[PDB]
Design a protein around this ligand. Sequence first.
Ligand SMILES: [Fe+2]
Length: 287
Amino acid sequence: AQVTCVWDLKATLGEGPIWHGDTLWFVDIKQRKIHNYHPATGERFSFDAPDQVTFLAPIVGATGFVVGLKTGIHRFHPATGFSLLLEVEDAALNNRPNDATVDAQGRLWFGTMHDGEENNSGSLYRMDLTGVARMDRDICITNGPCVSPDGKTFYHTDTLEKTIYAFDLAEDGLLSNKRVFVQFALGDDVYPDGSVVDSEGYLWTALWGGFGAVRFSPQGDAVTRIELPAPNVTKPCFGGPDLKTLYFTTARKGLSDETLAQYPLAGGVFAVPVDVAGQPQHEVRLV
Ligand SMILES: [Fe+2]
């Protein structure tokens, strides 16, 4: 299939794409923006955030999004802006939220990270109507929380360790039986960024420094690799009428001026048709 650059956005750190309301929502973390792309018309919308904004999730029974800001978990509405829901960590850590997913029970799983990308201060959190629980700890850069279609397996990535872990996910939301799922040896400077799981239970992982994304079987073997004209690919997101259009956010962060001249579409939004559909986006049950 041919890859299309559908938005030559040149984002600094495009991240956190979701498919919602039949359109693509995502963020630019470092430019502090929420973006919205309508594939049917090409319309583009952008919203300024008061701090770094790192993930978006729709809410059950309500309008707007729950979003991760460096200053805490907020509610966002285009008309009214940002309102604090919960501060999850002590500001002195210089942490920020990063990636997130919503499981089929309406739980929001999100990670935090050292914004300086040096300390092992990040954690994994599970947020729902029973509160916020810390589920894993001591990770420098968390990434790519996601769950299988049957709801029994949970994946989480420690990016700088180049490792995706798998867990048993119980019906009551507890994790057990952590094990290595995939350890990356695709290059000295290739790291796993964000991941999603498709309708067959295969994991799609975007590669920082790896110019694309890899699809893994539930047993952890790579079965296909997509190439993009962008060194840093941050996250996949299934969209389109059949959830068979795979979108990718990318990042210019970390690339020299010479590399950006060579790969000027770095930071753009890319799209490619794939054969197996993704999973439908779930909504957070906040109350
Ligand atoms: Fe990420």
